Design a protein around this ligand. Structure first.
Ligand code: HEM
Ligand code: HEM
Ligand SMILES: Cc1cc(N)nc2cc(-c3ccc(CN)cc3O)c(F)cc12
Ligand SMILES: Cc1cc(N)nc2cc(-c3ccc(CN)cc3O)c(F)cc12
Ligand SMILES: C[C@H](O)[C@H](O)[C@H]1CNc2nc(N)[nH]c(=O)c2N1
Ligand SMILES: C[C@H](O)[C@H](O)[C@H]1CNc2nc(N)[nH]c(=O)c2N1
Ligand SMILES: [Zn+2]
Lengths: 412, 412
């Protein structure tokens, strides 16, 4: 009822009572743990008021006005609108709070120390794909800030019936294209091969190369989605060089500066915002470890080992590890030498322990997913490897949602 | 009821029904996941027969003689002895099966592909600490095999009342001593500083240096424990050199060849073997990452960075990662160049995926702890990082148990 999490590198103990406020299910049971499952798993007017009530109760209990006059009137105000319209609308202030807390509660996010410095763009007045394009361009511009990156989210109209959903079909506003070849192999980013072919299917003219920035596929009010090309002046790219190995430029790699996920659902007081792209800045390992070295991604460990004069015969020469560190030194150096915001996994994971300490004190806990918080390289030399973490689902929250092309009743 | 685990680097799917046989609790609930908690948490004659029955039912269902003549008579035989003595004794064959399956079910073990090749030493006729010493010496000798290491376990008499417990007080048969200094800092292994001082308290004469092999503290039949020094000819050590950096010998490091954990409890058909040291061989990262580079262990990343000509000012130079790979190339090379069995974390984690495939087919599942299976360096370039894993508690099993000095009613 008052659970303890320990750090085993520092012997520091924190006490979690925030998990008592938790509401949703985790997938684990008393007899099975599913903490390594990647994705474990239309609303009515009945379930909607407890969700509004619960949300409004914590919003007013956060501006030091819990149960007060304005809280009880807002409670009644929302109840009235949920009777009237079987839904309701959030105040601008409630939308900013909810969004910030969906990030605050993202247990898989190592970057949450910044959760309160989040710029919320209210795009709930949007109606067309072009409007979405415009809103997304201002999001990208703003969040990029000429390389001094700034956290932001853009919130398109909430789901209503379910057939009039706003969706960004891209998993991220800025992704490189992936193209399969005659010999089967993949140019560009293999992760996006399916989406890259959907864009061609909708009329995209592919410059079938490596780091081709994909177009946006924006669906408005449940209408069929439409392609828009982000002006390349808004797409900030960092070419990757090493601070020792001058052959590293010959590798000819680069990555975009702005990680901006667009395929997730924002949940606030029972309301579902099916299109809510949010962006921060990269932790280096996302690019250099996962993007560049996953077998099913850019898979460059082959070449980087070669040009380093590496023992590639034996598995036990650790040529894979050795090339992996060099790649991440290079990504970090390249981003910093261009004044493009980036964080290394030591600084990011120390920041998170520090953030974890703040939440357990002023909030009673911090939902955290160890499987996702520990970086994908050098796990145990970072402080989070040794940090016991309680995972649990608080709301407001970001939730996974299916790709739109599996669910969208087409017509055109 | 028939849960699916996915690999996301290979898209391979397996179906787990073995978890249905699971019995014990995990610590997780429907509303909280505790998969990153390190340690989540006298018997009677009532609970003992379901446990015997369940065990015997799976033992005879494994020699293709389930429910047959000899099974029903053994069932009755054990029932009779549990009425008579309120406990029972395992057959030699049942002890070997149970031990092998406690390993097979160790969800935190990446080395389980070898689970059936386990040499079981029956030491249930032991009565004195000297006998335990003798048994442990033969275990170490046998398992070391002049560097061609072999898996083994030695099983001392099962718990009876609880005040007559056999215990090895060492957490591992072979550990280096840790000594605190006048200036507070630690010579040797900081993990063992408390145990090293207990040995001095019991009369150990410390050669207060670095890699001093600790003595054995053996408790027999609940009597106060007694010190014995393993003959150094039985303690096989590998001095660590690099296959490039000749200053690596100047580091003057070495590690023992034989990982042999002795502080855990083996549970077989409700019987509790409080002293059951088991040994395999090292996966390289246990030594080079955790033993050598944990902050609260040997903590050598300082020196290894130095002698490499490394940028140690900035955190983001990844000097910690770069020195970490070199250390693990060296440990692997040093062990292999001495024909001492060792496995690198790429070969070990590939073997485990292969093992995972075997268990899901011929057994319906493989309980696995992702938090512990993924190696502590280069997580995502190993196949297990991308492997969803179901964790659940099967029996027979190895369980954690408190250190004896917190629980043992002394007298001498
Ligand atoms: C400020 C800089 C940020 C950093 C350094 C950061 C870092 C990370 C990393 C490394 C992950 C793991 C994802 C992966 O491995 O692919 C992650 C996940 C996540 N982040 Fe953060 N992030 C940042 C900003 C944000 C913002 C601004 C939001 C929302 C407003 C956010 C919400 C999330 C969510 C919801 C997830 C997990 C979603 C899932 O289940 O996959 N993050 N973050
Ligand atoms: C054959 C070579 C073996 C290898 C390469 C291996 C590898 C490993 C590794 C890397 C761990 C993680 C422990 C840590 O990180 O400190 C582990 C845990 C474990 N191993 Fe294996 N092991 C081997 C043999 C065995 C044997 C022979 C047994 C038992 C008969 C065994 C039972 C266990 C158990 C019970 C744990 C986890 C205990 C806990 O909860 O901490 N292993 N193994
Ligand atoms: C906001 C933010 C910043 C950052 N620096 N990185 C992120 C990474 C993700 C992510 C990507 C892909 C997948 C699935 N492979 C899961 C994720 O959580 C995300 F949603 C948001 C991120
Ligand atoms: C049998 C075997 C082989 C190996 N190569 N390594 C092991 C490591 C451990 C271990 C050590 C310490 C701790 C706690 N820090 C937990 C463990 O599981 C173990 F029990 C058995 C091992
Ligand atoms: C199977 C496993 O759950 C899956 O590979 C997860 C593991 N942890 C991760 N952690 C992060 N940060 N990002 C990921 O994509 C993953 N993938
Ligand atoms: C807090 C966390 O549970 C703890 O550090 C665990 C993480 N995973 C581990 N994995 C292995 N193999 N060995 C360990 O000691 C640990 N420690
Ligand atoms: Zn769990």
């Amino acid at each position: 009822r008052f659970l303890k999490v320990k750090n085993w590198e520092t012997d520091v103990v924190l006490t979690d009572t925030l998990h008592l406020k938790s509401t949703l299910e985790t997938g684990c049971t008393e007899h099975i743990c599913m903490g390594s499952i990647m994705l474990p798993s239309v609303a009515t007017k009945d379930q909607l008021f407890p969700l509004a009530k619960e949300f409004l109760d914590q919003y007013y209990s956060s501006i030091k006005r819990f149960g007060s006059k304005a809280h009880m009137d807002r409670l009644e105000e929302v109840n009235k609108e949920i009777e009237s319209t079987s839904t309701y609308q959030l105040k601008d202030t409630e939308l900013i709070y909810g969004a910030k807390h969906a990030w605050r509660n993202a247990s898989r996010c190592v970057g949450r120390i910044q959760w309160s410095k989040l710029q919320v763009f209210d795009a709930r007045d949007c109606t067309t794909a072009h409007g979405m394009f415009n809103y997304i361009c201002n999001h990208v511009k703003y969040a990029t800030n000429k390389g001094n990156l700034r956290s932001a989210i853009t919130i398109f109209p909430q789901r209503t019936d379910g057939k009039h959903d706003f969706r960004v079909w891209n998993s991220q506003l800025i992704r490189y294209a992936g193209y399969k070849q005659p010999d089967g192999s993949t140019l560009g980013d293999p992760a996006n091969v399916q989406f890259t072919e959907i864009c061609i299917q909708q009329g995209w003219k592919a410059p079938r190369g490596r780091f081709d920035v994909l177009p946006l596929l924006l669906q408005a009010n449940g209408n069929d989605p439409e392609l828009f090309q982000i002006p390349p002046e808004l797409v900030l790219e960092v070419p990757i060089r090493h601070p020792k190995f001058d052959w590293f430029k010959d590798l000819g790699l680069k990555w975009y500066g702005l990680p901006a996920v667009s395929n997730m659902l924002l949940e606030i007081g029972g309301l579902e915002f099916s299109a809510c792209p949010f962006s921060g800045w990269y932790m280096g390992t996302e690019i250099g470890v996962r993007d560049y070295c996953d077998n099913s991604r850019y898979n460059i460990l082959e070449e980087v080992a070669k040009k380093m004069d590496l023992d590639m015969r034996k598995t036990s020469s650790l040529w894979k590890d050795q090339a992996l560190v060099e790649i991440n030194i290079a990504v970090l150096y390249s981003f910093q030498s261009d004044k493009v915001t980036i964080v290394d996994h030591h600084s990011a994971t120390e920041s998170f322990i520090k953030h974890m300490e703040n939440e357990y004190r002023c909030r009673g806990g911090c939902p955290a997913d160890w499987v996702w918080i520990v970086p994908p390289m050098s796990g145990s030399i970072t402080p989070v490897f040794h940090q016991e973490m309680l995972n649990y689902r608080l709301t407001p929250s970001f939730e996974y949602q299916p790709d739109p092309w599996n669910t969208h009743v087409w017509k055109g």
